[PDB]
Amino acid sequence: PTQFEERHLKFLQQLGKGNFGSVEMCRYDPLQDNTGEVVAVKKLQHSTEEHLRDFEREIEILKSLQHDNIVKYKGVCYSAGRRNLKLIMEYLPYGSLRDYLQKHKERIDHIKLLQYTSQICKGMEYLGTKRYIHRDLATRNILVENENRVKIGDFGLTKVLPQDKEYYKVKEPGESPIFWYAPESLTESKFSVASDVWSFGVVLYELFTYIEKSKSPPAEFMRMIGNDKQGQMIVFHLIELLKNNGRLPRPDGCPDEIYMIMTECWNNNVNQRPSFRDLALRVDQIRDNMA
Ligand SMILES: Cc1cnc(Nc2ccc(C3CCN(C)CC3)c(F)c2)nc1Nc1ccc2c(c1)N(S(=O)(=O)C(C)(C)C)CC2
């Protein structure tokens, strides 16, 4: 019952476009009586063989995850012979946390941000117990099920660690979200639980800027290295900036202990970054104090 027939997927709209993939809102309505449920359908935008094998691995990863803060796998659809493989997931109605936060910023306070932050930590820790490296954590990948629950919502870049190493080396061709990447990911293409923690620090920054426009990591980092650079030079300068302990600023209104969580996630020393369990503990302690 995790096999969807393509003929019954009714396209409703395009939700998002990304890592060689696209996500659409559809209605699965096999009875053709308009009682089927609305689902999210992910497909490749250009189905090469390398992208198909990556997509199949991403599907297997998501099917292996069951957690309150991980988007639910529903099934696959490939009635177009081999190709046009599509991943069926639950549809979350409030969209990405990036959009949601931006749209409701005047009625989401810091205790609510910390609720979201803690759920993100629990999701990421579960990923780590499976030895999965997410790589692409960002508020655009975090989805809002309702006002009290968010979920990690996309796994297109997630890799499994080798059984004998604590990192995974990978250089994907294309534009990489460098303003969320740990320094050792920029210099050595090394991804680990610790670089996921660096990126989680960027997600926390994102949350506390409420997705204010000029305050995004790309905007702040390009302001710090100078908007006069272009091309590969950008990466180079970013690397230098991070190696001289250049960092994203404290967002307006962010308390010092929250910014300190951020700065501890952004340690150049990979082994000195906190664990996700410790991140959840600290966030939950602060949230309790605020109440
Ligand atoms: C699996 C899933 C489940 N439910 C939802 N619901 C949902 C509902 C509404 C909106 C918007 C649409 C219009 N605006 C105005 C209002 C709400 C929405 F965007 C999503 N979306 C999902 N995936 C999903 C969708 C879109 C994007 C995703 C991921 N990313 S992404 O992960 O980075 C990437 C690129 C796929 C790699 C970034 C964009």
What's this structure's resolution in Å?
A: 2.1
Does 224 lie in the same domain as 111?
yes
Token representation of residue 277 = 């369990």
Torsion angle of alpha carbons 124, 197, 204, 233, nearest 10°? -130
What is d(CA 92, CA 72) in angstroms, rounded to the nearest whole number?
10
What is d(CA 122, CA 111) in angstroms, rounded to the nearest whole number?
17
Token representation of residue 113 = 């941000």
Does 159 lie in the same domain as 140?
yes
Phi, psi of 79 (to 5 degrees): -80, 0
Burial of 81 (0-12, 13-18, 19+ CB in 10 A): exposed
**Range of the structural domain that residue 286 is part of:** 97-290
CA angle centred on 185, ends 179 and 189, rounded to 5°: 130
Bridge partners (DSSP) listed for residue 17 = 22
For residues 92 and 69, the answer to whether their CB atoms sit within 8 Å is no
Bridge partners (DSSP) listed for residue 16 = 23
Burial of 22 (0-12, 13-18, 19+ CB in 10 A): middle
Instruction: Provide the 3-class DSSP secondary structure of residue 90.
Output: strand
Q: By alpha-carbon position, which residue is closest to atom 9 of ligand 1?
A: 95
Token representation of residue 228 = 């006069």
Does 126 lie in the same domain as 22?
no
Listing DSSP states for 129-170 in one string gives HTTEE-----GGGEEEEETTEEEE---TT-EEPPTT-S-EE-
Does 190 lie in the same domain as 138?
yes
Does 158 lie in the same domain as 124?
yes
Q: Name the active-site residue from 136, 196, 252, 284.
A: 136
Please report, in range form, the residues annotated as the binding site. 15-23, 42
Domain CATH code at residue 56: 3.30.200.20
Is 136 one of the annotated active-site residues of the chain? yes
Token representation of residue 136 = 């692409």
Phi, psi of 143 (to 5 degrees): -110, 155
Domain final residue pick, 57, 90, 123 = 90
71 lines ligand 1 (CB under 6 A): yes
Token representation of residue 174 = 């294309």
What is d(CA 7, CA 28) in angstroms, rounded to the nearest whole number?
9
Burial of 288 (0-12, 13-18, 19+ CB in 10 A): exposed
For residues 17 and 45, the answer to whether their CB atoms sit within 8 Å is yes
For residues 283 and 114, the answer to whether their CB atoms sit within 8 Å is yes
In the reported structure, the alpha carbon of residue 23 is separated from the centroid of ligand 1 by a whole-number distance in angstroms of 7
How many domains is the chain built from? 2
Burial of 90 (0-12, 13-18, 19+ CB in 10 A): middle
Does 213 lie in the same domain as 280?
yes
What is d(CA 137, CA 245) in angstroms, rounded to the nearest whole number?
22
